[PDB]
Ligand SMILES: NS(=O)(=O)c1ccc(S(=O)(=O)NCc2cccs2)s1
Ligand SMILES: [Hg+2]
């Protein structure tokens with residue numbers, strides 16, 4: 001079924017998921033000169049103080065680090081949001097070369113990878129009811145550029161050998177997601193969708209202005225991962241990013 005190759009990659013997704021062609025799809029190009037600075041946007045409140053990670057899993061499209069979301073332990077509030085959104089997981093999208101890999105672009109510039117911290121609106125009781133709502137999800141997106149090592153990222157990089165193929169998981173407790181944040185929390189925000197099937201239009205995107213840098217050896221490890229399951233022919237998990245979609249009647253507000 002879907003994936004990222006020539007035969008099953010994003011330009012075919014519309015045949016099984018018609019909403020691919022919809023009105024509020026992500027990612028988009030952020031044109032900085034056309035973004036509306038909006039001084040009513042409150043500051044973001046990221047409270048990742050009591051976050052509990054549980055495991056890391058290769059799901060055949062990316063690796064995800066899952067968090068215990070049965071209590072308000074790691075939450076996002078403020079900014080463009082109303083209500084509290086709980087952290088349930090984070091994943092990355094990366095490229096086969098350092099000059100591509102982000103999903104969102106800034107003035108058409110692509111970064112090496114993009115981190116998504118996925119949150120769901122607690123108003124709706126669980127993630128499953130939240131993906132049935134226009135304001136059910138908030139994804140915090142962070143660009144990664146190649147440069148110095150991000151020390152807080154190393155823990156994730158060392159375990160990737162344990163989960164090389166589709167379906168494997170490892171326990172991954174006590175990981176603190178605060179080590180992945182930039183100094184500045186300035187952002188752009190617009191309404192969009194998930195960037196992989198089912199491509200539901202449930203998401204308030206918050207894309208941070210400031211990138212974090214990781215070294216080439218760190219993003220290099222991402223590329224050694226596999227799309228295939230164990231014992232199937234190896235396909236390297238590289239280029240698992242969707243192309244920018246038409247913004248069509250949406251405006252990107254900027255907090256700066
Ligand atoms: N790239 S992204 O951040 O926009 C995401 C892609 C998929 C995401 S999900 O795993 O949280 N939901 C996928 C679903 C699972 C069950 C019902 S929909 S978040
Ligand atoms: Hg929705």
Ligand SMILES: [Zn+2]
Pocket residue numbers: 091092093116195
């Ligand atoms: Zn994503």
